[PDB]
């Protein structure tokens, strides 16, 4: 069973505010991240929307243009969410930031995509471990 269409929160400038505006309020309802966390987070908004006009005004990476936005949202989650702090760990953050993900494609459209939730937490994954093996005893 082909989906036979295409959904992504990258599509339009429109829906990738509504997506992070909406984020960041599941974010502020988990109480995981503090406040300056949070403004850290917001500021990705804009960079991904600055970023965006440029690439779309330009004629390279249609298509790759989509894996760069995803990796380079991703990897600011990852870096913020890898934080010593206190009292806090980065698997319960990232598990928070999965579920307020889950809930922002439900007010952009209104449909759960937990393909798309994961395919995300796997490249803080991978940023966070810095494409690198390690002991993990």
Same mark, same amino acid.
């Given at each position: 069973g082909?989906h036979?269409?295409?959904?992504?929160?990258?599509s339009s400038?429109e829906?990738?505010?509504?997506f992070i505006?909406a984020?960041?309020?599941?974010?502020?309802r988990?109480?995981?991240?503090?406040a300056?966390?949070?403004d850290?987070?917001?500021?990705?908004?804009?960079?991904?929307?600055?970023?965006?006009d440029?690439?779309?005004?330009?004629?390279?990476?249609?298509?790759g243009?989509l894996?760069?936005?995803?990796?380079?949202?991703?990897?600011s989650?990852?870096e913020? +969410?890898?934080v010593?702090?206190g !009292?806090?760990?980065?698997?319960?953050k990232? =598990?928070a *930031?999965?579920?307020?993900? #889950?809930? +922002?494609?439900?007010?952009?459209? !209104?449909?759960?995509?937990?393909?798309?939730? =994961?395919? *995300?937490?796997?490249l803080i #994954?991978?940023?966070?471990?810095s494409?690198?093996?390690e002991?993990?005893?």
């Amino acid at each position: 069973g082909s989906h036979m269409g295409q959904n992504t929160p990258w599509s339009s400038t429109e829906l990738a505010d509504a997506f992070i505006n909406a984020f960041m309020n599941e974010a502020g309802r988990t109480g995981a991240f503090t406040a300056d966390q949070l403004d850290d987070m917001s500021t990705i908004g804009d960079t991904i929307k600055t970023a965006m006009d440029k690439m779309a005004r330009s004629n390279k990476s249609s298509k790759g243009k989509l894996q760069a936005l995803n990796m380079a949202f991703a990897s600011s989650m990852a870096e913020i +969410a890898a934080v010593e702090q206190g !009292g806090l760990s980065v698997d319960a953050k990232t =598990n928070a *930031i999965a579920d307020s993900l #889950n809930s +922002a494609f439900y007010q952009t459209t !209104g449909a759960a995509n937990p393909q798309f939730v =994961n395919e *995300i937490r796997s490249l803080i #994954n991978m940023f966070a471990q810095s494409s690198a093996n390690e002991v993990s005893y």
